[PDB]
Design a protein around this ligand. Structure first.
Ligand code: WHY
Length: 284
């Protein structure tokens, strides 16, 4: 029975290696990674891989791994797929821990923009969880943490992390991770998956996929939002993506809104993530 080596980058930056049978469905690999992580609340997570166009794709757990990675390496990342709007309602501290690890990468990477003060507050909770109580022996006036807090580090940010860290004495790791999440969940780009697109006029926009629906970002003052319950049908055709909106009260007709994506693969990828969000957040 022939097996393929899988390499999975974990949220702590380490690499998990295992073997699966070459005809294995994605769920097989996911279940092994989740067992390695001691993770029971698995529904919020998934594996990503890079396609031949180097685009991030979710590994479909119902489909053969070989039919998704195709010509590419069996190399994957473990990631948050569905960002819970209220992390306090998760049943296990370890779920909140992996969510914190994902959000730290969202922040450092610039995917999750954040004010100075929120960067410093999130950093201070990470330091409290991982090192415990502030110690002045491991931090003089010139201290720079090993922890990555932001897409661009400044001395002023390091100073502010330490000032807030001092305020958290006695705080336990689950308590600090909960505080981290209570702040992170309020950021305007929390759990927003962004897709470059053009509107039916050719104007460049972003489409954001998240718990609260499909968001359209246009010119700054011009942004729209379609809550999932309002969306009856999601479809794609060639380079185009379509949402069918419920008729408004007393309106005779449904309305169909169309967008242009970079290529057919990008339209199909946006369709699949929208359908998956629509199903998940309908049930959660
Ligand atoms: C770090 N390398 C040894 C293998 C690798 C490369 C890329 C990904 C992804 N996704 C996972 C694993």
């Amino acid at each position: 029975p022939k097996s393929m080596q899988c390499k999975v980058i974990l949220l702590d930056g380490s690499e998990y290696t295992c073997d699966v049978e070459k005809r294995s469905r994605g769920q097989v690999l996911f279940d092994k990674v989740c067992e390695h992580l001691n993770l029971l609340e698995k529904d919020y997570f998934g594996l990503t891989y890079r396609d031949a166009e180097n685009q991030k794709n979710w590994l479909d757990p119902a489909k053969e791994i070989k039919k998704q990675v195709r010509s590419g390496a069996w190399h994957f990342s473990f990631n948050v797929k569905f960002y819970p709007p209220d992390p306090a309602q998760l049943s296990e501290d370890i779920t909140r821990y992996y969510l914190c690890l994902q959000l730290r990468d969202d922040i450092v990477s610039g995917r999750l923009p954040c004010s100075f003060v929120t960067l410093a507050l999130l950093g201070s909770y990470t330091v409290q969880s991982e090192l415990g109580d502030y110690d002045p022996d491991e931090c003089g006036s010139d201290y720079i943490s090993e922890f990555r807090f932001a897409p661009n580090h400044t001395k002023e940010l390091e100073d502010k992390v330490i000032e807030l860290h001092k305020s958290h004495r006695g705080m336990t790791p689950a308590e600090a991770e909960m505080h981290f999440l209570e702040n992170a969940k309020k950021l305007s780009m929390y759990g927003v998956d962004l897709h470059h697109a053009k509107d039916s006029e050719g104007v460049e926009i972003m489409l954001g996929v998240c718990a609260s629906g499909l968001l359209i970002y246009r010119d700054r003052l011009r942004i729209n939002r379609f809550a999932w319950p309002k969306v009856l049908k999601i479809s794609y055709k060639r380079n185009n993506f379509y949402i069918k909106i419920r008729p408004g009260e007393f309106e005779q007709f449904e309305s169909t809104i169309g967008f242009k994506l970079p290529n057919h693969r990008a339209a199909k990828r946006l369709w699949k993530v929208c359908v998956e969000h629509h199903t998940f957040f309908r049930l959660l």
